[PDB]
Design a binder for this molecule. Structure first.
Ligand SMILES: O=C(NO)c1cccc2ccccc12
Ligand SMILES: [Zn+2]
Length: 206
């Protein structure tokens, strides 16, 4: 059993409905890490993500490196974001995705605060590099993003970093799905009851 975990950061946004339709058309489930301001602007998309079998988790309020890590606001922001999501879907998610990744921002003390707050942390195993092709022609960029993902996929479990707020990322998803299905991956959402650690610190507590 090989499982691919597509994860989408920084939304919701104006390409998210299209992404959801694409995922549904391929019966794929994915994971979304949402920014609080966008949760407030797009509550219907938050509802739809959760209703259609995807995992909805937190990606902070400010996405501000200095505030989250140096000033130590990571857990406070994730808790605030958690509440905004819970207001819509009636569930308080536990999984967080650190802006800029956990390394080196989430130091010793912050990782303890995460655990003590009942949160988990997922980084990723495959970076799609989708930001490299920002503002480039969409279909060509998508093909390049798909090959970035497809070649890096080797392990039984892969967690793939993408951003649904960018057109070229959403456009890459059909080719990614096809390419990974051929290699025997199934596409699942994150599952709180089935947590396994995926973080740059190899901290098995989060
Ligand atoms: O937060 C991120 N993913 O959404 C993220 C991870 C790693 C590096 C970054 C650099 C600039 C902006 C964001 C990131
Ligand atoms: Zn981000």
């Amino acid at each position: 059993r090989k499982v691919a975990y597509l994860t989408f950061d920084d939304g919701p946004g104006k390409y998210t409905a299209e992404l959801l339709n694409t995922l549904k058309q391929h019966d794929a489930k994915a994971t979304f890490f949402l920014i609080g301001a966008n949760v407030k602007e797009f509550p219907d998309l938050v509802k739809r993500e959760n209703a259609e079998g995807h995992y909805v988790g937190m990606h902070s309020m400010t996405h501000n490196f200095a505030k989250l890590y140096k000033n130590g606001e990571y857990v406070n922001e994730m808790k605030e974001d958690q509440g905004l999501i819970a207001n819509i879907i009636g569930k308080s998610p536990k999984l967080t995705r650190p802006p800029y990744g956990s390394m080196p921002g989430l130091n010793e003390g912050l990782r303890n605060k995460v655990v003590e707050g009942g949160f988990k942390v997922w980084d990723w195993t495959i970076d799609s590099l989708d930001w490299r092709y920002n503002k480039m022609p969409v279909d060509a960029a998508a093909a390049q993003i798909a090959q970035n993902v497809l070649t890096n996929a080797t392990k039984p479990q892969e967690v793939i970093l993408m951003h649904d707020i960018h057109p070229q990322s959403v456009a890459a998803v059909p080719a990614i799905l096809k390419g990974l299905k051929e290699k025997g991956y199934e596409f699942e959402a994150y599952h709180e009851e089935s947590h396994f650690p995926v973080n740059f610190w190899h901290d098995n507590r989060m």
